[PDB]
Amino acid sequence: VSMTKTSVDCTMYICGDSTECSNLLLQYGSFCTQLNRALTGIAVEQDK
Amino acid sequence: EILDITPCSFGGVSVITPGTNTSNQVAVLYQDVNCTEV
Ligand SMILES: *[C@@H]1O[C@H](CO)[C@@H](O)[C@H](O)[C@H]1NC(C)=O
Ligand SMILES: *[C@@H]1O[C@H](CO)[C@@H](O)[C@H](O)[C@H]1NC(C)=O
Structure with missing residues (x-):
């Protein structure tokens, strides 16, 4: 029914600390x- | 000596607020982190 909710930040993931x-x-x-x-x-x- | 390295920038920021016609007060949701900035 529900799938694991994953919010990926493309600011941190793509460019680490830069x-x-x-x-x-x-x-x-x-x-x-x-x-x-x-x-x-x-x-x-x-959630819906 | 041995030093563990944990990256910075813990968690994201989510703004929880009612409609514009209701009120301008907001409630900030810090995700997966303890109260720090405030
Ligand atoms: C807010 O809602 C009230 C009641 O429906 C309406 O009279 C008014 O025009 C609305 N104002 C804005 C800024 O949307
Ligand atoms: C935030 O505080 C709670 C208090 O129990 C703690 O369990 C949790 O680990 C803290 N934050 C993180 C992500 O460690």
Whole structure:
């Protein structure tokens, strides 16, 4: 019925403890923002 | 000597708030971490 809810942070996972790496990540647009909302919708549907 | 290394940046931050037309008060949800910042 329920699947294990996993919220993966794409800011920390992709670039560990690095602002300069995250500065290059912002050039990719919503790839971080969109995938984080995709896993967010999964955790919400598992609750529903 | 032997020193264990535990990475920093514990947990995420989730904002819990009612609607805009209700109130502007918010409740911050710290995930999987003890009260620290406050
Ligand atoms: C808030 O809700 C009340 C009651 O429905 C309505 O009269 C009012 O226009 C709403 N105000 C805003 C800012 O949405
Ligand atoms: C937060 O405090 C509780 C108190 O029992 C403790 O069990 C828990 O381990 C603390 N946070 C973490 C992730 O260790």
